Nucleic acid binder design. Structure first.
Length: 798
RNA sequence: UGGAGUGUAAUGGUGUU
RNA sequence: AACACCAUCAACACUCCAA
């Protein structure tokens, strides 16, 4: 449970399709770079970079480095130092800096690591290279999180009010098969427009000009302007000095008063306008507008609008209106070719091969994106049943149930209707029409509604939920489903899930109000999928004969994900397959320490599933496929250490000396890796993304370890995010082709739609279970997520 | 709450007049 | 009570499901 497995082979299945990734090939010298520790007493990163810059130029006689922003420093060539601390002093129109030698980061070892010589890739080297590549834009651009942003060169994309659209990019140095690469992905966000506050007022209050009004209109405009400007920074323009607006004056600049404290003699009552007239010899062109209160309320510092400008680099947090969000998505999340050309454009205007800090270390980055071969895997046949037992073939990652019926359809004979929407806006005609339509779609799907509901009543208040269901359960012998019509976002849903999933173990299905009023066959169809799954039936199965050889022996599939609160316990969810299709899953959910991604009680959970598996299959799993979702790279060593043992432990304490092969895989949807079609004809749909099933396990993947990219879904909008799979462990010794095909095939067992999803069904289900347990003093709440006896044996989370 | 896709700080710590 | 720094994968919105 210590070392991750090396990549066994390279996949050869599927048709090859020429691709380009957003990785940029880097040329790195064999020189050793020198690392030094800094000690600065007592400061923000920008201040540190500035201080280091001064220290660089002011100590050139004694001693062109790159800087981390925090105590960490690197140089290309060595300098006059020793292990001894060398402390000095600098001055900013006042700091003490201590430079100490640390280490010699050899890039020869990096070439040896990328090559077959050394198995391990030195992390310190990756850190160093990243610091080098980031030192310039950390000062040149506006850093946000792990990205760098900036304004627009020519045109200015506006949003209205004081906002505008700033574009940016996220860079990170990554290792590859033979050559270090620079991963870069563009992004965009909303900053505050660098304009005079007078114009900020104009734009916020919908003024064509400031001279449209000469007297303030109302307190409400003061509140609106305050709501927009309170917290922002502004710079002054009659001296330079940057200030932070704390409030807005009620009174005009001509009447807003303050204690003048004119040297000795203390205070005299003076108005702001009069102050600017006397002190700064400035008559207010617009004395009638109120003032910005800056600094401390006790300090009484006020400023007229015509001397304040809003400083740039201020990102917005305020809510965005319809036009703002529209213009945002109408200028970002563009099609794949557009994003591609934007990244190319970015690599053109950033110009890394000309920057001095980059040139200092003799690094060369390719101005063209990385060409990668790639291959599109083959979609599995989906077997439907009914009288015809028709087959559905996924085309472009999507299929349909046209002239097809469920592999195992359930004849629904007893069901109920409980509408929580007001009858005023939800008539009985709506309910009856919805019932007819639903019955038709149901009978067509292979899950026939054999007759009218045995119950149909309006209601109100969450408090009506718990009593009623009991009554409903005791009156009608053998009811199968309870349908709950909801009027939109409501805590009622949460109570319906509480009573339904935990208390009685009754199959419940909520439907939003509007979908009862206006009904489309698609909605009713997917809804029927959900119903048929919730009642223990089987929508569709993978073609039995068309499966990887892993299915030749009893194998269980596990999915795991963790969800964290907005102080409250986090929750980890682990699901497991219960047949050999594999269509049916059972869910286990636990509560945990705050924001602890490492699943603590995993072992126990696994045990349950394993036990349940046997109970459902009368077979003991010879193999365990564990899809862990939600963990990033920096956690792997930790997670792989505990959870794998937790899995293994669960296999030992259960029966004898039973140790099946565990295949620990990590799913990742959150990463900065993009893929584009080289051939224009290979583009798919309006978004022009790569075809569903696109697999890449070369060039841009890990040099030694077992990882691969898989885009298993069709891009509906924007640019697809290819799901990343990193095999942290493999006892079954899978081949690349077999495991990739297995994954892509498990991406088709999602029962909520007739489409291929981005991540495998177990992981998705785990996410759904976790997010479901979210709606449901620590040991008290620990029993709140424990679902019902009968609910356990179902897929309620769907 | 029919479904899929993709766009965008909180805490504990040290410290401050 | 504000303000600095170091360690740490939920909401909202849009697109698509006529010819």
């Amino acid at each position: 449970a210590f070392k991750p497995p090396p990549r066994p082979d390279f996949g050869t299945s599927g048709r090859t399709i020429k691709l380009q990734a957003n990785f940029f090939e880097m040329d790195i010298p064999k020189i050793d770079i020198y690392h030094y520790e800094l000690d600065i007493k007592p400061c923000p990163r920008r201040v540190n970079r500035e201080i280091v810059e001064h220290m660089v130029q002011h100590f050139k006689t004694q001693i062109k480095p790159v800087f981390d922003g925090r105590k960490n420093l690197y140089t290309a060539m060595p300098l006059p130092i020793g292990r001894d601390k060398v402390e000095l002093e600098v001055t900013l129109p006042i700091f003490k800096v201590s430079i100490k030698w640390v280490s010699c980061v050899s890039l020869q070892a990096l070439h040896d690591a990328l090559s077959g010589r050394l198995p391990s890739v030195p992390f310190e080297t990756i850190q160093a290279l990243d610091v080098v590549m980031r030192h310039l834009p950390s000062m040149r651009y506006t850093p946000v999180g792990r990205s760098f942003f900036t304004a627009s060169e020519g045109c200015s994309n506006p949003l209205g009010g004081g906002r505008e659209v700033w574009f940016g990019f996220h860079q990170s140095v990554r290792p590859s098969l033979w050559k270090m690469m620079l991963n870069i992905d563009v992004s965009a966000t909303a900053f505050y427009k660098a304009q005079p506050v007078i114009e900020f007022v104009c734009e916020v209050l919908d003024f064509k000009s400031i001279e449209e009004q000469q007297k303030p209109l109302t307190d409400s405009q003061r509140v609106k302007f305050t709501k927009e400007i309170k917290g922002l920074k502004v710079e002054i323009t009659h001296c330079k000095r940057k200030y932070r607006v704390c409030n807005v004056t009620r009174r005009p600049a001509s009447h807003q008063t303050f204690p003048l404290q004119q040297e000795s003699g203390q205070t005299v009552e003076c108005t702001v306008a009069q102050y600017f007239k006397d002190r700064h010899k400035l008559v207010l062109r617009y004395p009638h507008l109120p003032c910005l209160q800056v600094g401390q309320e006790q300090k009484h510092t006020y400023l007229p609008l015509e001397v304040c400008n809003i400083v740039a680099g201020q990102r917005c947090i305020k809510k965005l209106t319809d036009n703002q969000t529209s213009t945002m998505i109408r200028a970002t999340a563009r099609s794949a070719p557009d994003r591609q050309e934007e990244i190319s454009k970015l690599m053109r205007s950033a110009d890394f091969n000309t920057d001095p800090y980059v040139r200092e270390f003799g690094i060369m980055v390719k101005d063209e994106m990385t060409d990668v071969t790639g291959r599109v895997l083959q979609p599995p046949s989906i077997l439907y049943g009914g009288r015809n037992k028709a087959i559905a073939t996924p085309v472009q990652g999507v299929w349909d149930m046209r002239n097809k019926q469920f592999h195992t359809g359930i004849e629904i004979k007893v069901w109920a209707i409980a509408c929580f929407a007001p009858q005023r806006q939800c008539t009985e005609v709506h309910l009856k029409s919805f019932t007819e339509q639903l019955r038709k779609i149901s009978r067509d799907a292979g899950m026939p509604i054999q007759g009218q509901p045995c119950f149909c009543k309006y209601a109100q208040g969450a408090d009506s939920v718990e009593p009623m269901f009991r009554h409903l359960k005791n009156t009608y012998a053998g009811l199968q489903l309870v349908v709950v019509i909801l009027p939109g976002k409501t805590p009622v849903y949460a109570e319906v899930k509480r009573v339904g999933d935990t208390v009685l173990g009754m199959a419940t299905q909520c439907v939003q109000m509007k979908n009862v009023q206006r009904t489309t066959p698609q909605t009713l169809s997917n809804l029927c999928l959900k119903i048929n799954v919730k009642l223990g039936g089987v929508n569709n199965i993978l073609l039995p004969q068309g499966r990887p050889p892993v299915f030749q022996q009893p194998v269980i599939f596990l999915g795991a994900d963790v969800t964290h609160p907005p102080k409250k316990p986090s929750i980890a969810a682990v699901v497991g397959s219960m047949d050999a299709h594999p269509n049916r899953y059972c869910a286990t959910v636990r509560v945990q320490q705050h924001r602890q991604e490492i699943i603590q009680d995993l072992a126990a959970m696994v045990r349950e599933l394993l036990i349940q598996f046997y109970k459902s299959t009368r077979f003991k799993p010879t193999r365990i496929i564990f899809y862990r979702a939600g963990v990033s790279e920096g956690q792997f060593q930790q997670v792989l250490h505990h959870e794998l043992l937790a899995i293994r432990e669960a296999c030992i304490k259960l029966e004898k000396d039973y140790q099946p092969g565990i295949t620990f895989i990590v799913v990742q949807k959150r990463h900065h890796t993009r893929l584009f079609c080289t051939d224009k004809n290979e583009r798919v749909g309006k978004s022009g993304n790569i075809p569903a099933g696109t697999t890449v396990d070369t060039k841009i993947t890990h040099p030694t370890e077992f990882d691969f990219y898989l885009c298993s879904h069709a891009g509906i909008q924007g640019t697809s995010r290819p799901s990343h799979y990193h095999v942290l462990w493999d006892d079954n010794r899978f081949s690349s082709d077999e495991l990739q095909i297995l994954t892509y095939q498990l991406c088709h067992t999602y029962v909520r739609c007739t489409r291929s999803v981005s991540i495998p069904a177990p992981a998705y289900y785990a996410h759904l279970v976790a997010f479901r347990a979210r709606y449901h003093d620590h040991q008290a709440l620990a029993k709140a997520v424990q679902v019902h006896q009968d609910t356990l044996r179902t897929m309620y989370f769907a």
